[PDB]
Structure 1
Amino acid sequence: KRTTMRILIGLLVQNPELATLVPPLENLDENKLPGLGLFRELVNTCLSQPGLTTGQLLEHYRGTNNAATLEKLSMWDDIADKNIAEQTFTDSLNHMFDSLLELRQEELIARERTHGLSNEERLELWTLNQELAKK
């Protein structure tokens, strides 16, 4: 499989302190990722509950319509770590960002061959291509 909103969420579930390691989502938003809202809510809620834990998370969502999804991520043996969790969080986050920058790149070039994006937007692409040339 791919990253998907599963690694970012399931890692945050198993490690709610990763909520302090996540950015303010400026280049992401809930618009560019149709489902990041679940991750963003979870982080936002973790930041709203200082001292929340892996197990206490389910108790904070006890009996919620979303608890079933959170149960799936909690019982998620597909990771089950805490050291690899942080590394995979950064790598996953990088993958999400990479993909959004890839999408943005294609959006920009799709607006060059017709609309004509600005000289700056056409240059932004060069810089972005250099960032993508070396992960």
Structure 2
Amino acid sequence: TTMRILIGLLVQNPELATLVPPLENLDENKLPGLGLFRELVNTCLSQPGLTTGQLLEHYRGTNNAATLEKLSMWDDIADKNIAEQTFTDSLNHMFDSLLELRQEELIARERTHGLSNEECLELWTLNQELAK
């Protein structure tokens, strides 16, 4: 669901794709079908100063262009500056998956064979960032 919103926002306003913080190091296996989003972000970053049609026509060789076109119309709003905050919030939510992974693995290791002082300390440090 969130992936559909992210893709729709990315396709609707290709200009904002230049403001995306780097996410190349992140694995695409965490979120479902995240490879399409990362590929779209990299492609849109490669050509700053573009229109929505020229971004849409890029993936005409593949069969996933229909999804991009159907998502672009969806969640369409006239105001431009309003969408930047929503996109930023979605990006922050997506980036929070890394902290989610890190705390989940630490909790799993705690349940498997416990944790030492430093391990629970780093778990606490990671968890403090989740609330804020």
User: TM-score, normalised to structure 2's length?
Assistant: 0.81
- Aligned residue for 1:10? 8
Contact 1:7–1:89 (Cα < 8 Å) also in 2: no
Give the unaligned 5+ runs of structure 1. none
How far residue 58 of structure 1 moved from its aligned partner, in angstroms, is 1.7
Contact 1:105–1:125 (Cα < 8 Å) also in 2: yes
For residues 28-81 of structure 1, give each alpha carbon's deviation from its aligned partner in whole angstroms, at most 9, with x where no partner exists.
321222311111010111122333222222222335311111111112136565
> Given the superposition, is the C-alpha separation of residues 24 and 127 from structure 1 closer, same or farther in structure 2, using an over 3 Å criterion?
same
> Given the superposition, is the C-alpha separation of residues 80 and 123 from structure 1 closer, same or farther in structure 2, using an over 3 Å criterion?
farther
> Given the superposition, is the C-alpha separation of residues 74 and 109 from structure 1 closer, same or farther in structure 2, using an over 3 Å criterion?
same
**How far apart are the structure 1 equivalents of 2:101 and 2:78?**
31
**How far apart are the structure 2 equivalents of 1:65 and 1:96?**
25
Say which SS state the counterpart of residue 113 (structure 2) adopts.
coil
Contact 1:10–1:76 (Cα < 8 Å) also in 2: yes
User: TM-score, normalised to structure 1's length?
Assistant: 0.79
How far residue 90 of structure 1 moved from its aligned partner, in angstroms, is 0.9
Say which SS state the counterpart of residue 30 (structure 1) adopts.
coil
Contact 1:20–1:47 (Cα < 8 Å) also in 2: yes
How far residue 117 of structure 1 moved from its aligned partner, in angstroms, is 5.4
Contact 1:14–1:82 (Cα < 8 Å) also in 2: no
How far residue 26 of structure 1 moved from its aligned partner, in angstroms, is 5.5
RMSD of aligned alpha carbons:
2.4
**How far apart are the structure 2 equivalents of 1:63 and 1:35?**
19
How far residue 118 of structure 1 moved from its aligned partner, in angstroms, is 6.2
For residues 82-121 of structure 1, give each alpha carbon's deviation from its aligned partner in whole angstroms, at most 9, with x where no partner exists.
2221101111111122244224312211112214456544
Q: Greater helix percent: which structure?
A: 2
> Given the superposition, is the C-alpha separation of residues 123 and 82 from structure 1 closer, same or farther in structure 2, using an over 3 Å criterion?
same
**How far apart are the structure 2 equivalents of 1:67 and 1:40?**
15
Of all paired residues, the percent bearing the same amino acid is 99
**How far apart are the structure 1 equivalents of 2:12 and 2:115?**
43
Say which SS state the counterpart of residue 68 (structure 1) adopts.
helix
Contact 1:16–1:43 (Cα < 8 Å) also in 2: no
Is the aligned partner of 1:75 residue 2:73? yes
